[PDB]
């Protein structure tokens, strides 16, 4: 079930990441009438184009942050108590991922900026180390 994990706790929900990932990118008579209805043709085509663009934006971010290739990545940015002052048991104390997300909300943009800078500094450092 695609959103079967919707009621799951954040911890439990980690085991369904794959089903959602697959769903995100999921008759001659139908083709003939859809093409004639120029507007329906375009509306459906636009939807398909957008789905691709959204998919790619998420993949690019995982690339930029150094998390590509995995559904789960650890980073090198420490957690700030400002974003959330809950402890580990509290974060996973039967909270629905969705509820937790509602609590973080606006702090998301900050986190992404930190991840992006961290990865770029890391690549420079690795380039220099490889040269040595």
């Amino acid at each position: 079930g695609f959103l079967g994990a919707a009621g799951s706790t954040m911890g439990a929900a980690s085991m369904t990441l794959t089903v959602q990932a697959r769903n995100l990118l999921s008759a001659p008579e139908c083709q003939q009438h859809l093409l004639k209805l120029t507007v329906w043709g375009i509306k459906q085509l636009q939807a398909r184009v957008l789905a691709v663009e959204r998919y790619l934006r998420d993949q690019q971010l995982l690339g930029i942050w150094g998390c590509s290739g995995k559904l789960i990545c650890c980073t090198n940015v420490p957690w700030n108590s400002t974003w959330s002052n809950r402890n580990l048991s509290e974060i996973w104390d039967n909270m629905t991922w969705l509820q937790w997300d509602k609590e973080i909300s606006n702090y998301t943009q900050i986190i992404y900026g930190l991840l992006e800078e961290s990865q770029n500094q890391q690549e420079k450092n690795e380039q220099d180390l490889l040269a040595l």
Binding site: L71, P78, S84, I111
Partner: protein, 439 residues
Amino acid sequence: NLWVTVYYGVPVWKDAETTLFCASDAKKKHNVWATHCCVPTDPNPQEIHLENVTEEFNMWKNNMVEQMHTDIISLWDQSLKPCVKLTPLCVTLQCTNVTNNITDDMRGELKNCSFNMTTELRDKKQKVYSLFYRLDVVQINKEYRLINCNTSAITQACPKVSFEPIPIHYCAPAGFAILKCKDKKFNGTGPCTNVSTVQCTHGIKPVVSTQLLLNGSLAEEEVIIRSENITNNAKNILVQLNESVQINCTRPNNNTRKSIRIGPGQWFYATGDIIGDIRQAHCNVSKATWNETLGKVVKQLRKHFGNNTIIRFANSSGGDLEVTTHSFNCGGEFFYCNTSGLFNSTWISITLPCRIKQIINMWQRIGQAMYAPPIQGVIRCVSNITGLILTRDGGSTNSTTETFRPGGGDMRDNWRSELYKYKVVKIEPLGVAPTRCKR
């Protein structure tokens, strides 16, 4: 000592407005809806119950409703777009009454017109004779014209095209999901407990009607009243019933059709002579069924207005035929039925006369009128009344009695009846959470 971890594929979503796909059962032909809502629905709905999930629904702000309204009108126009124009027929008509086999009820309602119109060749003219209903023809200065001559163009619907409602399923695009509210006895807005996820909606038949709602859902276990604001007398009230009321609608007259060549490759379909006696179209409603059904509604209305408040119904309101009467598309012809016999009671079989009209401004917009070809033989429809559209005629200092009228001039509110339980959300797979790891 926790560090940032990024997770992709988290079960998180936010409200959104997108384009849905039109899908239908994978099985007749020449039906506008069945032909164009071409994507098949063979798999059973993948309904996934969400355990311990609370979500807020709001039918009055639902964009699935707006989307159906827009798409239905658009599709309607595409269906009629390639059909023959009747603009060549907007000529002075010579008309007399039909006096043949006339009863008192149809006296003056059916009129016999003749006129000078074109032929295959542009040099010739022909005189033809057709019947019209009084509602379509206006007197000028025996001299008449069609009413839709000064404000609009008239086109004829293609005789091969059916407008019979068939089930339509709206399906989400990838990246989106439809949340379904299964709470029983759910009121138009607020949180739902029994929430499930589906890829497509329940099939909906795009039935067009005014005043009474037909062939929809039955409100589960009881009469349910839904409104945007019950207090505000400017809002419409949608009431769903838990018993179907049977209504039989008949157009007893046996028609024949005449095919006339208006021009090269073009045809006009005219109403020919009636064979047999002339009678008024009408609909039958069971007396007891209606009386008990209405009483159930009244009890539910007192639930919100008080046990010392008298509820009375009034016979419609003044206005255009399209809103003062109950409109059907029965058999493909358009009936305009008088509901005064249904809404004349005070709380502390029934036959409805109907008139027939052929030139229809089906949508509220003006400038495009469609001419319904006549249907030969005799028409009979049997259908289920599944709900009411009521208006509370409030705004006065009379706490003692409230007056209700049947009404509603906007089809938009008809789709709200079936779509009240669905919401569209967008999936947001990236989530960030701390844990006991770091690079």
